[PDB]
Design a protein around this motif. Sequence first.
Motif, short mmCIF file in Angstrom:
data_model
loop_
_atom_site.label_atom_id
_atom_site.label_comp_id
_atom_site.label_asym_id
_atom_site.label_seq_id
_atom_site.Cartn_x
_atom_site.Cartn_y
_atom_site.Cartn_z
N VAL B 138 0.87 -1.17 0.00
CA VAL B 138 0.00 0.00 0.00
C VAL B 138 0.91 1.22 0.00
N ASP B 139 0.50 2.19 -0.83
CA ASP B 139 1.11 3.51 -1.04
C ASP B 139 0.29 4.30 -2.10
N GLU B 140 0.71 5.53 -2.43
CA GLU B 140 0.03 6.32 -3.47
C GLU B 140 0.26 5.42 -4.67
N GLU B 141 1.39 4.76 -4.54
CA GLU B 141 1.94 3.69 -5.38
C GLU B 141 2.50 4.18 -6.70
N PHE B 142 1.68 4.85 -7.50
CA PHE B 142 2.12 5.44 -8.75
C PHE B 142 3.22 6.51 -8.56
N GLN B 143 3.14 7.31 -7.48
CA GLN B 143 4.17 8.29 -7.13
C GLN B 143 5.50 7.65 -6.69
N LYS B 144 5.45 6.66 -5.80
CA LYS B 144 6.66 5.95 -5.36
C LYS B 144 7.25 5.15 -6.50
N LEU B 145 6.40 4.45 -7.25
CA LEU B 145 6.76 3.61 -8.37
C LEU B 145 7.54 4.41 -9.41
N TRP B 146 7.03 5.59 -9.76
CA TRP B 146 7.67 6.54 -10.67
C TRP B 146 9.01 7.12 -10.16
N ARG B 147 9.31 7.04 -8.86
CA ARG B 147 10.63 7.31 -8.25
C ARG B 147 11.48 6.04 -8.01
N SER B 148 11.01 4.90 -8.52
CA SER B 148 11.68 3.62 -8.32
C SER B 148 12.13 2.88 -9.58
N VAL B 149 11.98 3.48 -10.75
CA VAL B 149 12.41 2.83 -11.98
C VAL B 149 13.91 2.51 -11.93
N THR B 150 14.41 2.19 -10.73
CA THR B 150 15.83 1.87 -10.52
C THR B 150 16.75 2.94 -11.12
N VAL B 151 17.82 2.52 -11.78
CA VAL B 151 18.68 3.51 -12.41
C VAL B 151 19.23 3.02 -13.74
N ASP B 152 18.65 1.97 -14.32
CA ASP B 152 19.13 1.48 -15.60
C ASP B 152 20.23 2.41 -16.11
N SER B 153 20.90 3.05 -15.15
CA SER B 153 21.97 3.99 -15.37
C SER B 153 23.23 3.47 -14.68
N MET B 154 24.05 2.87 -15.55
CA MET B 154 25.36 2.23 -15.33
C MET B 154 26.07 2.35 -14.00
N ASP B 155 27.30 1.82 -14.00
CA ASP B 155 28.18 1.74 -12.83
C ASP B 155 27.32 1.11 -11.77
N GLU B 156 26.52 0.15 -12.21
CA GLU B 156 25.53 -0.48 -11.30
C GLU B 156 25.97 -1.71 -10.52
N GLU B 157 26.82 -2.54 -11.11
CA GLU B 157 27.57 -3.55 -10.35
C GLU B 157 28.45 -2.86 -9.29
N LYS B 158 28.90 -1.64 -9.61
CA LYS B 158 29.58 -0.71 -8.71
C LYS B 158 28.63 0.05 -7.76
N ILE B 159 27.36 0.32 -8.12
CA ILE B 159 26.38 0.89 -7.19
C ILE B 159 25.94 -0.17 -6.17
N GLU B 160 25.79 -1.46 -6.51
CA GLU B 160 25.66 -2.52 -5.49
C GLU B 160 26.92 -2.70 -4.65
N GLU B 161 28.09 -2.55 -5.27
CA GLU B 161 29.33 -2.61 -4.52
C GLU B 161 29.30 -1.48 -3.48
N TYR B 162 29.13 -0.24 -3.96
CA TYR B 162 29.04 0.94 -3.10
C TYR B 162 27.99 0.78 -2.00
N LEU B 163 26.86 0.17 -2.34
CA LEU B 163 25.71 -0.05 -1.49
C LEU B 163 25.93 -1.09 -0.38
N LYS B 164 26.82 -2.04 -0.65
CA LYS B 164 27.24 -3.13 0.24
C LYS B 164 28.32 -2.71 1.27
N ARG B 165 29.11 -1.68 0.96
CA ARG B 165 30.35 -1.30 1.65
C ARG B 165 30.13 -0.55 2.97
#
Lengths: 50, 165, 222
Positions: B138-165
Amino acid sequence: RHGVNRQDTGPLMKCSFEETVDVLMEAAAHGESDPMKGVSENIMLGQLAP
Amino acid sequence: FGVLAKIVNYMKTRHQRGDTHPLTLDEILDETQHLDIGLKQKQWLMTEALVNNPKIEVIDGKYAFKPKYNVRDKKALLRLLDQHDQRGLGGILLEDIEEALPNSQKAVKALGDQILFVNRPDKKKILFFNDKSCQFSVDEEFQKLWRSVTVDSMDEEKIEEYLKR
Amino acid sequence: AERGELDLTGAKQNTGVWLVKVPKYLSQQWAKASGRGEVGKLRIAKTQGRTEVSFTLNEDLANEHPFVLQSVGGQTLTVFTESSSDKLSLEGIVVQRAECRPAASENYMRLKRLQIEESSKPVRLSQQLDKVVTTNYKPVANHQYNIEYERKKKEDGKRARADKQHVLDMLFSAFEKHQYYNLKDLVDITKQPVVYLKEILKEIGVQNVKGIHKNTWELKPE
DNA sequence: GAAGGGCGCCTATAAAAGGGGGTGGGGGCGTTTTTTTTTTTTTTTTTTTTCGAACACTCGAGCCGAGCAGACGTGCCTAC
């Protein structure tokens, strides 16, 4: 034109002579450093020439 | 050929009417008002249109059921769906309505049970389909969802690395 | 094809002919005779080491042209004929060439200059204009446009649609001639609104497009 | 025939209601082809002083290394 550019002088001098964009593209691409030691670079920059 | 199409169209209407009772050629000629089509065409009908016909149903010594042959069960594809690999079948809304009974009456009950409508045979056209688990939060859902399209924007194996550290 | 056969009788007889250069003006004077008989006479005068050939005009048709002979040792020339009856024959062989020299000299030229006037004279620019405005002699209802409206003024702008079944008959008849047709051919053929005909083609057929929006419709033959 | 006269239709306004038609507005397909064999022409072709090299690329060529085969040399089997 093709000889003066082989000199190890700073890139901004070489731009002041016929090559313009091309020597700057190569200067940027290698990442060379221009020590502002010569007459032309200093006059273009505006500070008192040596 | 045109005359034959009028036979097809008549038969189509009769199937649509709900019946698939076979009739004699003569009756079909009559009902299609093509009685005076002549011996030759009749003969062409008998020795091509009626026998070289890839989906003609001969029953009770008479020719029936021309428009359809692919489906006879006239029910949801429970067997087709049950499979985990061969599942499926997006189908045309007009095909489902033609097959037996109009969709809309069953659908109004079905709309919160087994059927889903997508606009796809053009935005005016509709395809029928179906569902399963809930929405997650439960949420407005469409508003959160539209801020959650991830980042299909590179350096992403590195953004999980950064995110894990 | 015997029409393509070339008769060699002339060649085999070794028939000789003469080839003479004469002015269009001399032949135009000859044209007045219209083949009634002769145009004149040719005279040949021979001396100790000289030959003088000349033609003299008929006194009648006129109411001396010297001939100059040319060499023919470096080429062969023959005469072949082309009949109105579509038959070809080598009628004979050219044994001599020559040119007709004009007796009159500088005053002839005036005639020539007169002749020059005859060949060369369509007026070039020449007289200008002092007048100016004429144009746009007011149609108020454009004259072609009037004619097109007149064509319209004979029972147009209303279509069958309305006679459905009879229109279906036209569709069935047309479809008997060929498996597929352009929408434009059906519009010419059934004289009805396009959108209604489309609803019919949705009813009893499908559509099949190719290239640049080139579409043909068909009642799904089977 | 030429010309003037007489008769009659023309456009405006109105106002409605059904249906055919037009100019859009926008999207599509990006064609393939029918050929007209084309406006894409030769600018100026040069009027030349022309490079002025530098750099890339082309294509061929020759030395050199490994493998193969016969001659030379060695290893193995048989007979007195």
